[PDB]
Amino acid sequence: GRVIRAQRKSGGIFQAHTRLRKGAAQLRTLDFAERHGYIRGVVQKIIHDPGRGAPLAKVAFRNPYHYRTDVETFVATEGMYTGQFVYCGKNAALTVGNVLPVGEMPEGTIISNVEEKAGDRGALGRSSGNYVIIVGHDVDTGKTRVKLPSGAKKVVPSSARGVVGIVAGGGRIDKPLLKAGRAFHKYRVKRNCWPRTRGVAMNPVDHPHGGGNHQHVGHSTTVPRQSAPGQKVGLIAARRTGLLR
Amino acid sequence: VRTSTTFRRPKTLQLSRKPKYARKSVAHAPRLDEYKIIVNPINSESAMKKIEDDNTLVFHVHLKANKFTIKEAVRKLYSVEPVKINTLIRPNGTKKAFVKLSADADALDVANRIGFL
Amino acid sequence: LRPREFARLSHNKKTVQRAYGGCLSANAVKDRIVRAFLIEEQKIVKQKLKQL
């Protein structure tokens, strides 16, 4: 009878808390220097970005056209240290931290912050400890096949770039949170998504799951992909439920 | 030959207003002059004591008079040089000015010459 | 001192008489000098290597 908590997630009090953010983590804009050669930057500082599991690197590059210094916020890779030189471009060496086009890197290399399409400045393999693996090349069509952290294989333009190495901060989810307070603090610096009340504990007006003299769903929890926004709760378009016993 | 990727709009000649007539037939007389600044002196017991002690006259002053216009109005109306001006808006919504006169002049004779003692 | 209170001082009271004095520490300046000279000698020796 009322719109459900899922439907109210359109904005308002569910926005991301971005007061303490240390910059948007992006690659350099694909310019002439980075397309035909390489450009060197210095890692000024590695910092913690609240709401993010991976540390950020403040790499300072020289502007190739004007007398000033450009500072780029990168997703730090393991091994990055202050004062390390980072080379970005086609002729960059295959060293951890460098940025190269995926077409210039051999099969089986470990890369992160990969561009989906050359020029979007990083899309794939950015969470802490995640990476993308170069599976193969197709020179004739100028494409590169990569393996994503989810295991899905994707075809990307051979000019897409990616930072060599794995993202720093790996193993973050390996340690249990141990208490609701740690979950409380972890999610302050993120959106308003915690704590999560179950729909069975609500009323028929509050949720499709709510109601009854017992806490039961009352209907199959796998809903069609075509269901209305208010109906789309539970397991949406589930192809297979249950454990793999 | 352009060495900058941006196109900034060129500067054009901006003629100044040269009207064919005046929008007002006659300019208004100064609407806040010396006589409208000073309404009348205050002659309460506290005002009298300030006269005899601090060498300070107390005037009922127009709301939109600042410390500068009070000083010139006093100098023009009374030919006395004030050394300080302190103003307050009384709880009834009228400005009151404490005009501290210079050491060369006394507020007593100024008060008698005005005639409000 | 507070930011604006720095404006009342004399010039020599806010800086140090050295290259980059008042902006960098002495050890930082010394690293600047030696690293500058050493890399300059390298680019000379690399140029002499590649010119032949």
Add this chain to the structure above:
Amino acid sequence: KNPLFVSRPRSFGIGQDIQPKRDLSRFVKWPEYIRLQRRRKILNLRLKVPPAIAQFQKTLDKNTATQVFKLLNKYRPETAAEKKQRLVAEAEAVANGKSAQDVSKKPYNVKYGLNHVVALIEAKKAKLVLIASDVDPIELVVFLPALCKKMGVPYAIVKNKARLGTVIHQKTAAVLAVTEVREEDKNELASIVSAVDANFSAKYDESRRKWGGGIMGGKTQALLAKRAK
């Protein structure tokens, strides 16, 4: 040779000394009206133009155009001031008691204005028609070559409606029409008519079936040339 005049060459490679100021004209973010002008020109170059419109892209040659305009400038119409003096002179002539016919001679001037020229062509009174190639909207003159051809009026498509305007003391003129010229210039008009006819009227049948446009840009043309090679 002062030894202190030492050379300090700058390397402008990638990662080397700052890039020098170069011509960046092709990368400028031009204003919207500028882009609209230039991209409109490109659509006319790319799209398949119908023959009735594409016939206006083939205009009179330079030598014939100069010859035509030499003839026209002898027959520019009277200006406002010249009309005023002639009008006044007729007034004193009438006040003096003289015939208005014999005081002023018969005018010999270029006929201008779209409707007036169209009427002259339909009445077969125009011996030469000059149509501006850049009339916008184009429909104002699209029908004119066909109308000229049916009535057998020699017609040429001339550039710069602005040039036609200067002939007739205006800014722009859609068409110009020459009906009568003096016997001194009868040979000159006949020579112009013959050249214009051989250039435009004879080729009218073939031009009616020749679609314009179809020109692709330089980058695609070079790319296809490489593919062919």
Add this chain to the structure above:
RNA sequence: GUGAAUUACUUAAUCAAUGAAGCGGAAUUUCUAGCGUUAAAGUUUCGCGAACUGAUCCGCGUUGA
């Protein structure tokens, strides 16, 4: 909407980046947490004077899918 014998093309529209910075043609910078700008040499004319090249030309469709 244009072609070719099933396929190509891009100007319509869609998308994405930027500070719309080096696109398409031809002619022919990696042992270091440093600094890098306000051209100087060269070549002609009349003192940080001018002009040409240093910094090749051409096209112009900001580039990429």
Add this chain to the structure above:
RNA sequence: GAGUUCAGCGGCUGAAUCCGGUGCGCUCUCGACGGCCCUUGAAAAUCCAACGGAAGUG
């Protein structure tokens, strides 16, 4: 010379306001450190300094 205390006079005149100890003490602050976090804990106005070297009897 002020403030305070005290002793006198009919506003005025006399004095005194001095010398030291202490602390797991309280209040505020300051300095040097320590621990905690899948939590790392505002911005801008304003002010300063530096690299660079335009420029220059007065």
Add this chain to the structure above:
RNA sequence: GGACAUGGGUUAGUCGAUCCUAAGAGAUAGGGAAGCUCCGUAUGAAAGGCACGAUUUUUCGUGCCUAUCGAAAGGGAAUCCGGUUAAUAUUCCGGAACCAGAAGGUGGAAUCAACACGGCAACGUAAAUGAAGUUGGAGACGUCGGCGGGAGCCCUGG
């Protein structure tokens, strides 16, 4: 009597507001919408400056690269003591200071080796020119736990 009646009373360059920006509100550009208005906040905007030159065919050439509102608890220029009134005070009075800005003047220093010397150094000095452009710093930051110093109060010996 905080009632009733008549009068009197609140004084600032230094305390706040004003200035700054926060979350956020919000015009303009543009696009929606029958509309009321909605979305938008450097966006698909021609979104504004600065310096050179015997004056340039006495019709100007040549270079160089973001509104606003929003905090009397955030940021932030600079004031203290004694006294005075029936009622005001870091505001008045007496004394004693301070900050910001402006202009020339006295005195001193540097200067024809134009832009000071000393110390091995960390740095010091009463001075000690510095455009454009770049860059750094202050503003500018959580929380708890003891330990050390200071001030005021407390305690205490004459």
